[PDB]
Amino acid sequence: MSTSSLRRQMKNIVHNYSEAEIKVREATSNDPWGPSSSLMSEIADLTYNVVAFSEIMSMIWKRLNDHGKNWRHVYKAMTLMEYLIKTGSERVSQQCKENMYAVQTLKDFQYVDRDGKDQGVNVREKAKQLVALLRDEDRLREERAHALKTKEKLAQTA
Numbered sequence: 001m002s003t004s005s006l007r008r009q010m011k012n013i014v015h016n017y018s019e020a021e022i023k024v025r026e027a028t029s030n031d032p033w034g035p036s037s038s039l040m041s042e043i044a045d046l047t048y049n050v051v052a053f054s055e056i057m058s059m060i061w062k063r064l065n066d067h068g069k070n071w072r073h074v075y076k077a078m079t080l081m082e083y084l085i086k087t088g089s090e091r092v093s094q095q096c097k098e099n100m101y102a103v104q105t106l107k108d109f110q111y112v113d114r115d116g117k118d119q120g121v122n123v124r125e126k127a128k129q130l131v132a133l134l135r136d137e138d139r140l141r142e143e144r145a146h147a148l149k150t151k152e153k154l155a156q157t158a
């Protein structure tokens with residue numbers, strides 16, 4: 001709750017995380033609500049700074065390496081990546097393409113919670129899609145155009 005938020009912030013303070021690291025953490029939290037579209041736009045804007053780009057990619061990597069009951073860290077890190085890939089600096093997709101082998105290993109992520117529900121299949125499902133996104137240059141270009149087309153329409157109508 002505000003209690004998960006509180007602990008998250010204390011962690012931020014202890015580690016002296018940057019603004020970009022704080023944002024990525026929030027977007028990829030264990031909370032059962034999705035990364036907010038506007039927070040995600042702020043992270044996209046930060047991918048054009050070399051320090052913030054390094055921080056963002058490093059924190060995504062960390063989150064992607066989580067396990068078990070923290071599966072939402074991994075799933076949301078994939079969601080964030082897909083968004084950055086389509087809408088941030090093109091450098092994000094270049095780096096993700098070069099590290100495809102690591103997303104590929106998530107095809108075998110497993111987690112069954114205490115009620116016996118398979119939550120890990122969510123990670124496998126998303127990992128397959130992200131790998132299909134990265135392997136296709138033409139689709140990558142078409143998605144980046146469509147994101148700009150969206151931004152352009154939201155700006156002639158504002």
Ligand SMILES: O=P(O)(O)O[C@@H]1[C@H](O)[C@H](O)[C@@H](OP(=O)(O)O)[C@H](OP(=O)(O)O)[C@H]1O
Binds near residue numbers: 005025029030031
């Ligand atoms: O309660 P525990 O067992 O200590 O486990 C933590 C808990 O799930 C938090 O909700 C989570 O932070 P978020 O809410 O930010 O997802 C945190 O992730 P973190 O270690 O990667 O920050 C965990 O370590």
